[PDB]
Each structure stands twice: as structure tokens, then as C-alpha cells.
Design an enzyme around this catalytic site. Structure first.
Site, PDB file in Angstrom:
ATOM      1  CE  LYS A  46       2.272  20.814 -31.069  1.00 49.81           C
ATOM      2  NZ  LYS A  46       1.709  22.174 -30.795  1.00 49.81           N
ATOM      3  N   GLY A  64       8.327  23.139 -27.172  1.00 52.39           N
ATOM      4  CA  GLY A  64       9.357  23.830 -27.955  1.00 52.39           C
ATOM      5  C   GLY A  64       9.889  23.054 -29.149  1.00 52.39           C
ATOM      6  N   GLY A  65       9.017  22.299 -29.809  1.00 57.89           N
ATOM      7  CA  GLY A  65       9.420  21.449 -30.929  1.00 57.89           C
ATOM      8  C   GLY A  65       9.892  20.055 -30.542  1.00 57.89           C
ATOM      9  CG  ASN A  99       7.831  29.142 -22.532  1.00 57.33           C
ATOM     10  OD1 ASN A  99       7.799  27.909 -22.592  1.00 57.33           O
ATOM     11  ND2 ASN A  99       7.872  29.912 -23.611  1.00 57.33           N
ATOM     12  NE  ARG A 139      12.362  29.245 -20.645  1.00 53.13           N
ATOM     13  CZ  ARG A 139      11.579  28.450 -21.371  1.00 53.13           C
ATOM     14  NH1 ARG A 139      10.697  27.649 -20.781  1.00 53.13           N
ATOM     15  NH2 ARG A 139      11.675  28.442 -22.693  1.00 53.13           N
TER      16      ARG A 139
HETATM   17  N1  LIG Z   1       2.570  24.135 -37.162  1.00 53.00           N
HETATM   18  C1  LIG Z   1       2.228  23.767 -35.912  1.00 53.00           C
HETATM   19  N2  LIG Z   1       0.953  23.388 -35.649  1.00 53.00           N
HETATM   20  C2  LIG Z   1       0.599  23.019 -34.397  1.00 53.00           C
HETATM   21  N3  LIG Z   1      -0.667  22.641 -34.101  1.00 53.00           N
HETATM   22  N4  LIG Z   1       1.521  23.037 -33.418  1.00 53.00           N
HETATM   23  C3  LIG Z   1       2.793  23.418 -33.674  1.00 53.00           C
HETATM   24  O1  LIG Z   1       3.672  23.413 -32.632  1.00 53.00           O
HETATM   25  C4  LIG Z   1       4.983  23.964 -32.729  1.00 53.00           C
HETATM   26  C5  LIG Z   1       5.924  22.836 -33.122  1.00 53.00           C
HETATM   27  O2  LIG Z   1       6.778  23.309 -34.157  1.00 53.00           O
HETATM   28  C6  LIG Z   1       6.828  22.735 -35.401  1.00 53.00           C
HETATM   29  C7  LIG Z   1       7.357  23.481 -36.459  1.00 53.00           C
HETATM   30  C8  LIG Z   1       7.430  22.921 -37.732  1.00 53.00           C
HETATM   31  C9  LIG Z   1       6.983  21.615 -37.946  1.00 53.00           C
HETATM   32  C10 LIG Z   1       6.464  20.869 -36.887  1.00 53.00           C
HETATM   33  C11 LIG Z   1       6.384  21.428 -35.612  1.00 53.00           C
HETATM   34  N5  LIG Z   1       3.156  23.785 -34.925  1.00 53.00           N
HETATM   35 CL   LIG Z   2      14.074  30.912 -23.005  1.00 54.93          CL
END
Ligand SMILES: Nc1nc(N)nc(OCCOc2ccccc2)n1
Ligand SMILES: [Cl-]
Length: 446
Positions: A159, A165-166, A290, A292
Site C-alpha cells: 500500500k 480508499g483502494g 478520515n 472529514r
Molecule cells: N482485504 C484487505 N486487506 C488489507 N490488509 N487491507 C485492505 O485495504 C482495503 C483496500 O481494499 C481492497 C479491496 C479488495 C482487494 C484489494 C484491496 N484490504
Molecule cells: Cl466521504
């Protein structure tokens, strides 16, 4: 109370904020683009200032023009809403430097929470449960990076620290893809955030999105206002939100809620905020905060009786929270369906002129929207044109009311997702509750 404020936003949230201001006797300044002269809240505002042309860069993101508008009108504060400049620490800094009140936390706190690595370190220190991860930025040493991934256990997720937020992430399921996955996420983060910092977390396979609402005043009070489930998503965009989250017991709520409030105290948080968690196998894992007010705030208002925008305004003026923790009670259930001007097949924005419009009404029905008959949805902004929120004494009543309200809603002349929302309300797994973050896209693919 604040004499006069600039509403530095548009659409439904600008109208939401305007209504709160009117209730509190606060004078309103609607800054708008040249394409937004006919926005409902603009037409209702005490004063209006056109701050630039249609494109957001020269209007709603135009920091000088927004601050100039506050100056010329004699406004005392700026409410950023959500999106645009609401999570922009430099904007908040500039607002306070210019001598105006920013309706939000201190710029330092916005900055802390926008840096996902530093945010996580602060939460972990505060006692908030986080996802097992690197606890720090990843360097260039791929031997170290493989060791971190082994320690965590595959699958892992890389990340961007400036992301969220994705945005700015990819899943890694073995050593073979790790180096390239880190390298690509890094490149994407440098391009998008001018910040190439990345970190690693355990990838949770089937979690729910459960987020906690907080409020903190400048008198040192911090409270939690239960939770929202926001798992119903498409391309990381929420489609349906509800409160409380199904299957969350009062004991779990209390557990996680108290930790969120404590964290607020530890970091000197101020205003509304949301702690986002992944919830899986009965456990919470913090991912991001967040600072906000969010799109989905109304579901929380329905089940608690707390007007969150008015609280934001009271906090900014130096008033303490209007309620104590012991006075916050979850009552009933609320569901929100986002209404989007979008094509049903492409999911692309579908702007244009609304020719016929009718809002639903009735017990437990709340329609949050600036749209009206004859209103043109411009191509320049987000596709979300309204929010339908339904409250019931229980989840089944809320969903029943939502089905009825969706059938009363008329938005002709443009394509919307009303038909999709109805399908979700009638979905047997949604009706059971507790669907995960992958459900909607799986359903739509089937
Ligand atoms: N599934 C998941 N694990 C971690 N550690 N962090 C997050 O962050 C949210 C990101 O959203 C997604 C959703 C689906 C696939 C990949 C990321 N999701
Ligand atoms: Cl929002």
C-alpha cells in the site's frame, strides 16, 4: 456561534451544510463554479460568490479564490465538506494562517492521518488494533522485504502511504511477484502522490468494512457514535451503507468504540472523524482514518439523534459536545442508498437535464439531494446526485422502507442507479446481512 461561513463544496453536501447553518442562525456564503449557479444551496444561500469556471482545479480546488471569497464576504470560517480540499492539510494550514476557522481538525492532525504509515503507528501506540504489517515503510532491500512478507505470512498487500480508499495498492500471493509488486506500487504512488512511500499488510481475504464515527471537542471530550457497515462497494466506491453494523454486539461496539475515543484523546483530535476498520472473524483491524464528515454520515444521525454537521459547527465555535458518551444510544436501524447519475451498463457518469423529478416521503424517509425538475447535472463533478436514507425500528423495517422509497423516486431525463439499488435491497444475502467487501462485484459478475 460562528457569524458567517463559506461552504467550500457543492451538491448534496453543500445543501446539507446550509441547512445546519440556517438552523443555528449562521450566515452562509455559497462559493460556486460558473457551472453551478443553479445549485439548490446556491439559490438558498445568504450570499454567493462565483470563484471560477467549471473545472474543479479553478473552482472547488482553487485555494486562493476560496480564501478570497471568505475575505470579501467577512466570513469567519470555511466548511470543506467531503472530497475536494477537505483532507488537504496545506489548505487547512493556509485557512488558519489567513485567520479563518477551518471546520475540521488541526492541519497537523490531517497531515498525520493522510500519511498512512504514521497514522497506523499512532493508532497502534494508542491501543487501536491494526492489521499485522511492516510497521514502517518498505525500503529497496528485497531480502528484507521477502523476510517481512514471510513474517506476516502470504497473502500480503502493498500500500501507498500517501494513498487510501483502494487507491495505490496491489495484492501479493507469493515471493515471485513481490519485487515487481512493490516496484509498481511505488511507481504509481510517486506518479499520483509525489510520495513513493509504501508499506505492507497482511491481506485479509473476506473482510467487512466497518467504520466508527467519532466527535471530539476542544474541551477534551471525545465520544464514539457507533459504527457503519460500508461493505457494499464497486471499485472501492461505497454503494450502500448502514448503521449499526449487523452482528456487532453492544460489547464489541463498546470495545472498539472506547479505543477510538481514547485514540482521539491521545492525538488531540478535534471535530468529526471516522476510523475505518476491516472486520473479519469477529476482529477489528484499523486501516485508515478520515478527518472529514463523510458521505454516509446520515445513517449515524438516524440511529443516534445526533446532528453531526451541527456538532462540527458547535465544536469549531468553541462549544463542547452537546452529548456525553452515556447519553449516546443506538436505536433502530438505518440504510443509505447512494443515487448516482450513471449508465447501467458502462457505470460511467451520465450527466444531463433532469426532466421530471419526485422525491419519496413518509415515516423514516430522508432524501438528501440538491436535484430538482429542470436541473442539469454537469459533466465536471462526481456522479453522486443524491442519498436516500431510510430508518426503521429494526433492519427489516429500514430495508422495507427503502424498497418503497426507491419505487417512489422519479428521476427522468438521465440514467441512474435506482434500479440497481432496488436489486440490492431485494438481494437475499443483503437481506440476511453481513455480506463482505467483494459481494457486489461478485453478484454483478454472476
Ligand atoms: N482485504 C484487505 N486487506 C488489507 N490488509 N487491507 C485492505 O485495504 C482495503 C483496500 O481494499 C481492497 C479491496 C479488495 C482487494 C484489494 C484491496 N484490504
Ligand atoms: Cl466521504
Amino acid at each position: 456561534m460562528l457569524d458567517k461561513i463559506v461552504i467550500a463544496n457543492r451538491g448534496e453536501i453543500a445543501l446539507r451544510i446550509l441547512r445546519a447553518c440556517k438552523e443555528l442562525g449562521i450566515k452562509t456564503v455559497a462559493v460556486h463554479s460558473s457551472a453551478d449557479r443553479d445549485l439548490k444551496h446556491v439559490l438558498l444561500a445568504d450570499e454567493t460568490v462565483c470563484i471560477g469556471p467549471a473545472p474543479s482545479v479553478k473552482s472547488y480546488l482553487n485555494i486562493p479564490a476560496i480564501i478570497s471569497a471568505a475575505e470579501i464576504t467577512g466570513a469567519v470560517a470555511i466548511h470543506p465538506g467531503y472530497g475536494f480540499l477537505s483532507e488537504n492539510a496545506n489548505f487547512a494550514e493556509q485557512v488558519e494562517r489567513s485567520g479563518f476557522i477551518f471546520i475540521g481538525p488541526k492541519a497537523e492532525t490531517i497531515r498525520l492521518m493522510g500519511d498512512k504509515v504514521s497514522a497506523i503507528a499512532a493508532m497502534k501506540k494508542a491501543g487501536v488494533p491494526c492489521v499485522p504489517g511492516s510497521d514502517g515503510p518498505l525500503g529497496d532491500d528485497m531480502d528484507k522485504n521477502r523476510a517481512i512478507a514471510k513474517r506476516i505470512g502470504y497473502p500480503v498487500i502493498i500500500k501507498a502511504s500517501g494513498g487510501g480508499g483502494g487507491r495505490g495498492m496491489r495484492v501479493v500471493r507469493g515471493d515471485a511477484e513481490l519485487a515487481q509488486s512493490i516496484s509498481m506500487t511505488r511507481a504509481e504512488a510517486k506518479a499520483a502522490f509525489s510520495n513513493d512511500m509504501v508499506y505492507m499488510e497482511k491481506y485479509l481475504e473476506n473482510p467487512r468494512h466497518v467504520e466508527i464515527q467519532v466527535l471530539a471537542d476542544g474541551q477534551g471530550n471525545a465520544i464514539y457514535l457507533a459504527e457503519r457497515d460500508c461493505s457494499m462497494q464497486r471499485r472501492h466506491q461505497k454503494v450502500v451503507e448502514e448503521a449499526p453494523a449487523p452482528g456487532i454486539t453492544p460489547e464489541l461496539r463498546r470495545y472498539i468504540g472506547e479505543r477510538c475515543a481514547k485514540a482521539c484523546v491521545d492525538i488531540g483530535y478535534r471535530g468529526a472523524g471516522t476510523f475505518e476498520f476491516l472486520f473479519e472473524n469477529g476482529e477489528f483491524y484499523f486501516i485508515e482514518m478520515n478527518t472529514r464528515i463523510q458521505v454516509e454520515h446520515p445513517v449515524t444521525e438516524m440511529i443516534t439523534g445526533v446532528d453531526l454537521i451541527k456538532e462540527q459547527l458547535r465544536i469549531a465555535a468553541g462549544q463542547p459536545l452537546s452529548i456525553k458518551q452515556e447519553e449516546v444510544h443506538v436505536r433502530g436501524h438505518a440504510v443509505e442508498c447512494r443515487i448516482n447519475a450513471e449508465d447501467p451498463n458502462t457505470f460511467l457518469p451520465s450527466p444531463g437535464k433532469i426532466t421530471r423529478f419526485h422525491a419519496p416521503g413518509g415515516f423514516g424517509v430522508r432524501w438528501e439531494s440538491h436535484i430538482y425538475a429542470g436541473y442539469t447535472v454537469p459533466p465536471y463533478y462526481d456522479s453522486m446526485i443524491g442519498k436516500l436514507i431510510c430508518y426503521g425500528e429494526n433492519r427489516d423495517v429500514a430495508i422495507a422502507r427503502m424498497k418503497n422509497a426507491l419505487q417512489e423516486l422519479i428521476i427522468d431525463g438521465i440514467k441512474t442507479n435506482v434500479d440497481l439499488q432496488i436489486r440490492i435491497m431485494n438481494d437475499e444475502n443483503f437481506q440476511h446481512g453481513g455480506t463482505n467487501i467483494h459481494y457486489l462485484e461478485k453478484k454483478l459478475g454472476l
